[PDB]
């Protein structure tokens with residue numbers, strides 16, 4: 001009998017219970033006892049769900065109130081002094097680190113190339129590692145909970161090498177290399193593992209996902225060092241677990257480890273199987289990650305079972321486990337909550353709950369149990385998807401054949417374009433602009449029910465546009481925005497107006513802490529049926545003689561912030577999105593909106609995890625899909641791009657050939673753009689929470705020393721959606737007043 005395994009379950013609750021109770025706690029409506037009660041209930045619910053499904057190896061310690069990495073920081077006493085001076089209990093120290101205290105919060109960081117964020121482990125020279133036993137030892141206590149329910153679980157802990165390597169030296173210790181602290185942390189891991197075995201844990205999932213990165217040789221050697229120290233008869237068996245990538249470049253590092261087994265991601269990298277299976281020693285198990293833990297597609301059982309069979313061939317059926325490819329943290333909780341999706345489409349999907357049934361069916365299948373009814377129903381679902389008209393749109397398929405270098409190049413290089421733009425706009429030196437958003441629900445809500453006219457709703461959006469435009473005029477901004485009050489979010493607003501997308505009612509996935517996202521789903525070939533943004537931009541331009549920026553989200557961001565298709569490449573999807581947005585750009589320009597900003601916040605997030613062909617191909621096609629969107633315009637049309645990064649690759653920025661770029665900036669990297677003719681707006685203040693006309697005049701005089709004033713735009717770090725009016729007013733006034741003082745001396 002081949003076992004099934006789940007590497008982690010999302011903890012938000014099928015009804016977002018966790019959000020409700022954590023936010024109620026943080027607001028004071030709920031006690032900490034009520035919060036812990038709800039967490040216990042959620043875990044119990046999830047453990048029973050997995051047991052009922054038939055899952056053999058069920059996780060524990062996967063639950064969290066905020067972040068599992070943060071949970072290990074707490075447990076291991078990686079707690080900076082600043083969070084201990086407030087008389088907080090252990091859980092409120094946790095929340096303080098996670099979300100600050102109203103001390104700013106520890107840094108939030110993308111978890112590999114997933115859409116989840118963890119809280120960066122933060123270490124000092126003074127860090128003293130030890131088991132915080134005051135709180136409770138979370139993994140022991142939750143194992144013990146599950147056991148009292150009659151559920152044996154496998155505790156999940158992030159391993160020592162990854163935990164340190166993904167961490168960072170605190171402000172006070174800028175010279176510390178986190179991985180040097182390995183000898184100090186190992187005893188604390190060993191102790192935790194002894195306690196788990198004593199509680200009755202026979203196996204632990206020890207996550208070492210840093211194995212899918214490019215690791216320095218000096219870091220590669222630390223696996224043998226760590227795992228030699230931990231394994232022994234007084235600890236559970238350890239299953240060294242990787243996901244999201246290819247371990248092959250690091251095989252030498254793990255080829256001689258004493259651990260009980262390994263897990264690999266054969267969804268993202270099925271081709272690594274032969275080689276990784278080759279390092280397995282007699283006695284070691286191979287966990288075959290074959291049900292995707294980061295997307296929503298029903299798994300092809302025929303294909304997944306074949307992969308598992310390849311593994312069985314290598315190491316024996318006794319030593320193979322059918323697993324999720326990663327934790328199901330990255331997927332929504334339950335497809336049965338969806339009430340609006342057409343049943344044809346819904347048939348193509350599986351969310352977390354359904355993935356439990358999948359790993360179980362695939363394990364039965366390879367074990368020789370009769371699951372022919374389930375295989376046949378699955379083969380039907382797969383065939384229906386691949387045959388559907390939603391999936392392949394001949395028009396889009398033909399249009400993709402027009403893509404090339406030419407379609408992705410402007411009519412003239414920037415120097416000739418600048419001449420034509422200068423003639424048209426005559427923008428002064430140190431032109432001032434902002435990034436788009438300014439400081440809601442009832443009219444939206446009643447429009448959605450038919451309680452107010454299309455006519456009635458358009459009036460309030462327009463009044464708000466008007467308010468914002470007059471504001472920016474009043475304070476003398478040179479290139480204006482409409483404020484984006486009609487938009488809810490920067491991806492759904494587009495996806496809802498594109499063919500090839502589906503939307504959930506309840507497909508929530510945790511992004512960070514209690515902030516959850518409900519991504520769009522790309523189901524098929526994408527196209528744009530009609531204008532998406534034109535009406536509001538035109539209105540906004542009709543009420544000022546200042547140039548008005550059109551505002552779009554780029555193709556890569558729409559792709560990366562959606563659940564993508566798993567039957568066609570990322571590239572193909574981004575190019576279809578580039579083509580759709582090209583039509584939008586063409587419509588904006590035709591209608592007189594000839595300054596257009598395209599925002600690509602998610603470019604760095606999608607970067608392939610290792611150096612090599614895949615990474616360089618990605619940078620090439622990311623840039624190309626942007627250029628396909630933006631290259632049809634006249635020379636006198638001014639294309640802007642905004643990036644929410646401080647040190648994004650200068651090379652990639654040049655590849656976009658945007659007339660103007662805005663970059664967050666509030667070291668010497670401004671010099672990288674010296675002999676690059678296109679214009680740059682280095683963000684002057686953090687819109688996350690007034691500077692003075694002097695503080696600005698010092699910041700611009702600072703920058704102005706390393707960069708030509710003729711190329712320099714003045715703007716904030718990002719949109720001011722997430723701010724209040726009174727500080728927006730004073731902050732922007734100062735900003736413009738500053739520019740004018742420079743504008744005077746040139």
Ligand SMILES: NC(=O)CC[C@H](N)C(=O)O
Pocket residue numbers: 435436437551599600601642643644718719720721
């Ligand atoms: N996140 C972003 O890229 C912000 C873009 C958007 N135009 C805004 O100003 O809110």
Ligand SMILES: [Zn+2]
Pocket residue numbers: 435642643644645664717718719
């Ligand atoms: Zn930004």
